[PDB]
Design a protein around this ligand. Structure first.
Ligand SMILES: NC(=O)c1ccc[n+]([C@@H]2O[C@H](COP(=O)([O-])OP(=O)(O)OC[C@H]3O[C@@H](n4cnc5c(N)ncnc54)[C@H](OP(=O)(O)O)[C@@H]3O)[C@@H](O)[C@H]2O)c1
Ligand SMILES: NC(=O)c1ccc[n+]([C@@H]2O[C@H](COP(=O)([O-])OP(=O)(O)OC[C@H]3O[C@@H](n4cnc5c(N)ncnc54)[C@H](OP(=O)(O)O)[C@@H]3O)[C@@H](O)[C@H]2O)c1
Ligand SMILES: NC(=O)c1ccc[n+]([C@@H]2O[C@H](COP(=O)([O-])OP(=O)(O)OC[C@H]3O[C@@H](n4cnc5c(N)ncnc54)[C@H](OP(=O)(O)O)[C@@H]3O)[C@@H](O)[C@H]2O)c1
Lengths: 474, 474, 474, 474
């Protein structure tokens, strides 16, 4: 049980009810996190709004100082946190430690990027002569209270990516980690507690995403909603937000276009690492291959042999393929598998499920009439759709309701660049698997994949507004 | 009747049903505008989405070229359009002509500002050594189809402010003017038709905002909703938008803080011109004076004498105070007047209504318990709230549900600048009435006053997204 | 004779002495331009400094207005000016007209780019907590009087490229065109005169570059020296400038690296148009080919056949190859030709000179020991240096004392991009002949090729300074 | 003697000849620094140019890493270094330690500011339709070898301010500290040595500024000259630089304009701290007061009483006023004192010199005909010039050959802002003594006060160039 507590207004607090967390792989009970009540949610928010003024009052240098202390601590206790996070979400140990490190990176980067964010002075004379002596001194300002909600696959990394950019600007935070990953989320909160930030500046909220979900978003105290999860909730949040600003990173069905002149080995390598990373439980993974027929056979054989080299097993053993987050999920994946299989798809690797451990499947001959060709599995299954023209590949790629990223494997760069302009995605990688790729670059998604632009700098601009003082020079 | 038609996919079209427009002041019938059906709305949208690709294909120089042609034509026919616009919304002739001119200005400014909007190149090495040879070539892109909805008080000016920034970037437009101001809105469309933009690039939609309102917003073809109107609809739009981007300029209750060291004459002059402009039918007008008691009496007397100099009458006569847009409105204002009056407010000028022509009223001694102290009238009524400290004035100012702009009349600039940081508004004017002030400066509103940042440059960034091509340098 | 006059302080003035100008090709006398005295140079400068304050006082919109009027006029009289410019510097008619048009473009572009140049607001708190309430409002300002000196090959285009960016910012100008091209330079001044700019804002200075050269540069009234010419003068100017800012575009020996995978036809086409443009009298022309041995033979044959298609003759006949600016020049070129020839080079096309008309020569087998391999001819002679490795080509390319631009013809873009980082030039073109390429892009040169960065935006920043007002917010 | 060595290509080296350094106050021998020969200077430069390529090859993150290590070390040994620096240049102990701290700050700030410096992508279509598919990927690059020369009053602070911004960008350094301050300069080099930067990246050059001065600047290996010292040498450097880029911070005679509505107490406080800081041995000190007659008497009395409170004595005792750097200097100051005195100035405080310790003098009634009214003393002497109009004060202020900074003490900010536009300085402080003010703000000087813009960000842009790769999208 252990009984983890929330960090609220400078204090750790338990609740009348709890939620027991178990290890997706072994089944062991890791502990229990609070099941907050709306009354409690109200005190978190009240504490934050109360403390916002004086946080804003601090200097950027001082706020950046705290953020650095937090990241330092994270790096210190990276193995401790990694060991648990690994267990809580069935992620390989080493990989789980990496998540803690990349979080420290994002926190530090966000800290330094935040104190170098500047304003602008505008001339009335640029618009009309009569206003030549009129100027506008424009400076940025925080939006207020920011609600951050991280996903199960990156409960820590995708939490700091919201927390740090928000805090450096002068906003206050209310962190709501995923229930499955709430211990890890609270382990992160420990870092913010030790760093010593003023009481009320950083707060956590745990509990039944059903019991308190809509409540926390609809609350009038929240000025900005920063979320990462499924399209379904993202959509609800967009409506519950009203006219309040939001940042949403929803799902994705990232394609990998392979032209006739591509480096099939370089391509097979990138597609495997992208498609099967974390058992396909990544929104930015390569979810479908649109390969030109003439090179389909050769490419597919490479991918096939490469799949046969992926280790399958337990987190503690750093297996490439580990048990999916839960049964509801592994079942869903199983559905997509069958449907494709039934419709004629060709599994080049063995279809087999051990509990919630689904072995990596390579389906060749997948078609547009299969669910696997469009629906986001979030499991180790990769469909290969054979096209006969770059024109068709673009058409099929754009058809998807999603638009996170895309990949183009070719040697003709001017072409790759031209295709890239046509793909309805946020980012196109020319010769490399899709990845968030250094958190300094902008990250965004077209269509149902989200709302808003991410990346340290863009996150900071998003969660800030502008105040403009205009005066006349004598 | 005349029977004005919509501009759809390069053609002017009537509908089975029409809506007759009458002059707010005289009552004369100006003509009739189409009452579209959802079937028709579907063709407007279908035409636009069909034409978007090739508009995006053009060069910025070519798109900017068309926009300049439009503005040229507007300047040419400024009297023609002004004469009607003046009649349709009871605006003074000269002033109505100014609206047409300022629209040409915004269109030209948006055209040149648009072709100088550039991208950025990012270094993988700024984040992590291992990615030093990885770069991100980031360029802007249009969002697609943009729905522009202008208000009755600026059916033309607040239409071009959305249309031009949107088109230069590569977006297509579906213009929906207010029913009262739909002839003027269609007069503007004539300019876009003569300019010769490709068919489907610019389109108009007219009809019962009730019969087709939600339909046009909720339509899945619309990628961005740019609106200007009441808070009530703005709120509906924020929900109907879902997770699609929006720009909303709602209401306002702009305060004018007058400190003990202010230039009472300079102040009285600015407050009058702000408060009584267009009979108070401006979202950015000075709607409440928070004056320090020690100078309240003197200041109020100046304002009083100045009010007595405002001409009252008909549009064609360029009267300062003209008939309110309609009866529903003049009634609402009458309500606020009585309530304040009943509660003890002191009308320093005569309360009198002739049809829909309400004479300018100056209410001294207004208090927090009066509706006039918080609700946006949109009529010629100005409340004077006497405070006893800058601290109180800030408190009362921030209490309002609105946050468009504010004014501070003082000589202590460092103070004015400090106060400005505390006011929950988008812009603070130090010694001058609130105004949009040269459409190149950013324009935004805090709280219920809106969502998004305006001003030519900011409008262009808002209705654009970003595509990021990442590659590795060998 | 005609007897052209200088435009000084709003008036056209002749001088006691004149300089007669003759047509490089026919020999006819075009007319005569003033041979100013230092006394007269002092009045030009005194007029400018006197008028600077009130030009700065105008609004950007007003200054941009004048600049547009100038460009309009240029476009109007493009044939008139083109006809003479063509004769004065032995440039093809059509091409000379193009120069006038591109000048109008640069003037308009500079005008609009100039009124959108903005300032910045900085936070004391970004550096140290104790200064959190301290801010710096930074705005640009003009440097004052700018001296612009254009070259003979672009007496008009390379004059406006300095004049427009300088004037829009608030600086005043003293234009000194090349003696051979001074009629065309004065023809441009006519445009600035008709546009009606205030007296003293724009002024011309003509005369013996020997008699008045150093005098005009060393004068204490000049705040910035913007020059385009030979390395020799550029160097003198750098010393005579002292610690005053300068912009220098000197010579160049641009290489064109051709890798084994290049499109030899696309390459031969680009190299010909670059190398033989204006008879090689372009600083940005392809002056040496560093081709990989394996493709040297095939490539060279294409270039050879293509050279044989270049028309040779008179300006009025739009010949590809026209008479060189003068005898001193054609002689120098003849020297380089012989030396190479003597040393073993292989002329694949006929060596022949008719007066000052040297026919286009293609020298294969040129080596490092030849003058043609390093010295800038400024005549229609192209050396082909055969290398055996990209490593060698880079080495040979960088050896040159020049560094304007370079070209890489290959299909391996990541490679091209990697090579580009190693080349000591200002710009690298991947698959295309070197060109200034749209005057919006930055233009600069490494090593002896210059000092400063050009391109409309960069030119504007160069000829401006910054004023920073710092104050404390209460 | 100790016998300090230079840090050259990763090694510490003595020279055949040395220069013995003595403590300005006590006279004690601190030690001896090398007196290099041009042969040695050639090896420093050869080492640097040799190592430049691979330093540029590193990632920004790695270069920033080294810079942070250096600053950490400086903070560690701040007392050690402070103790000596205090002795070497007669600076108060505590103050000397502050110099070491502020250096660490600038080094760290420069490190983080450097890795967030980005490029831009330009559109051919912004200029001309035909080039719409042409784009320019512009990225920054280092200039190469940078020569940094620090002053005696900041041998360390004004060295790091050049070193850090230069190194983070990819340049190599050759540090030349002032002879009087060369031990401290070499103490700084120790930090760069311990940090472990690659050999040849950072180097020091010491020796007779006469014996090797021009040699080190004129050397063809140096690509950029960054200097801080007297106007005399600055001017020589501007000529010896040729057309190579430079950064020069020369002298100053900063005025403090005091209007009739100023806070005389707040003003007297700021003027004393600025004027008498480091015995007036600061280029940014308040060197002349231009006060409106009506408040001259009252203001002057405050300043007078405040002067009487300044401690006078030895460095180790943290005296406000310590011995001037040397006799040649104290003599020069004595000259200015007498001249003014002879001409009628009125010393309100005692004129007295003890060796090289000149007591702080306040001269009222100074006039334009006195040397003290224009010449930069660099000693504790403050002239009060009484004016009768803001117009006159501006006139007198601008008359000076210098233009570093200025101060305006008034309550009328719009006026202060208007005056500021007229003052020929780089920075204007409204109500506060002149100061460099947080090294993140831009720092520059008008007229003979320098060439180039400083401040961490601006320093980085200055010592960098731009490479532009242009290509066509298919
Ligand atoms: N700068 C400005 O112009 C400015 C600033 C602030 C506030 N305003 C507003 O201008 C308003 C005009 O009066 P109003 O009460 O009629 O406000 P409003 O309904 O918000 O008017 C604005 C626009 O809303 C349209 N509309 C109504 N329902 C719709 C819906 N369901 N979905 C989409 N569009 C719909 C109207 O067309 P129809 O007229 O046919 O219904 C009109 O084009 C004022 O009340 C004031 O708040 C203007
Ligand atoms: N087209 C280009 O943009 C382009 C680009 C790169 C290089 N170039 C250069 O154009 C050059 C043409 O030869 P050039 O003889 O014209 O070279 P140049 O004399 O150095 O340059 C010509 C310009 O400088 C003036 N000038 C000469 N001596 C001067 C001095 N002492 N001080 C100030 N100005 C002085 C000339 O007037 P005068 O007529 O009286 O000499 C003319 O206006 C080539 O060598 C080439 O390097 C042109
Ligand atoms: N804030 C400040 O730091 C600041 C600001 C403005 C003005 N100042 C100036 O600082 C000066 C203090 O130094 P100073 O009086 O000796 O003046 P200075 O010589 O101009 O400046 C000293 C620096 O210049 C070096 N140097 C001398 N001749 C050189 C040459 N010809 N080529 C290259 N470098 C050379 C010196 O070497 P050596 O010392 O070995 O001769 C030393 O590092 C004062 O005159 C004052 O006007 C300081």
């Amino acid at each position: 049980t252990k009984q983890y507590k929330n960090y609220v207004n400078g204090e750790w607090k338990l609740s009348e009810n709890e939620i027991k967390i178990y290890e997706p792989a072994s089944g062991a009970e890791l502990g229990s996190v609070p099941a907050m009540s709306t009354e409690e949610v109200d005190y978190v928010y009240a504490s934050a709004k109360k403390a916002q003024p004086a946080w804003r009052a601090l200097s950027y240098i001082e706020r950046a100082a705290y953020l650095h202390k937090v990241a330092d601590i994270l790096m210190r206790d990276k193995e401790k946190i990694g060991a648990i996070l690994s267990k809580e979400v069935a992620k390989g140990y080493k990989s789980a430690v990496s998540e803690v490190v990349r979080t420290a990176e994002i926190i530090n980067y966000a800290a330094e990027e935040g104190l170098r964010m500047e304003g602008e002075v505008l001339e009335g004379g640029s618009f009309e002569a009569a206003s030549k002596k009129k100027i506008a001194v424009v400076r940025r300002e925080p939006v207020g209270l920011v609600l951050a909600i991280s996903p199960f696959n990156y409960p820590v990394n995708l939490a700091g990516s919201k927390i740090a950019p928000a805090l450096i600007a002068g906003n206050v935070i209310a962190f709501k980690p995923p229930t499955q990953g709430s211990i890890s989320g609270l382990l992160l909160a420990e870092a913010f507690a030790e760093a010593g930030l003023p009481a009320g500046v950083f707060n956590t909220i745990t509990g039944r995403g059903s019991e308190i979900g809509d409540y926390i978003v609809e609350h009038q105290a929240v000025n900005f909603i920063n979320f990462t999860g499924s399209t379904g909730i993202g959509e609800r949040i967009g409506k519950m937000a009203g006219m309040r600003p939001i940042m949403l990173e929803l799902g994705g069905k990232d394609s990998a276009i392979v032209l006739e002149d591509a480096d099939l080995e370089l391509t097979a390598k990138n597609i495997i690492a992208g498609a099967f990373g974390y058992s396909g439980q990544r929104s930015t993974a390569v979810k479908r291959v649109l390969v030109m027929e003439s090179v389909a056979d050769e490419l597919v054989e490479k991918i096939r042999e490469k799949v046969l080299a992926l280790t399958i097993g337990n987190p503690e053993d750093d297996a490439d393929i580990t048990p999916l987050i839960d049964t509801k999920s592994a079942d869903y994946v199983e559905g997509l598998i069958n449907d494709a299989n039934d419709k004629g798809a060709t599994a080049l690797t063995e279809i087999k499920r051990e509990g919630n451990l689904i072995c990596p499947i390579l389906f060749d001959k997948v078609t547009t009439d299969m669910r696997l060709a469009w629906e986001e599995p979030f499991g180790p299954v990769l469909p290969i759709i054979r096209v006969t023209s770059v024109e068709e590949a673009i058409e099929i790629s754009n058809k998807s309701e999603y638009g996170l990223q895309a990949s183009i494997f070719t040697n003709d760069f001017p072409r790759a660049f031209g295709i890239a302009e046509q793909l309805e995605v946020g980012t196109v990688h020319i010769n490399n698997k899709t990845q968030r790729g250094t958190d300094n670059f902008p990250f965004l998604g077209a269509k149902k994949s989200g709302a808003g632009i991410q990346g340290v700098k863009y996150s900071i601009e998003a969660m800030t507004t502008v105040k403009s003082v205009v005066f006349d020079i004598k």
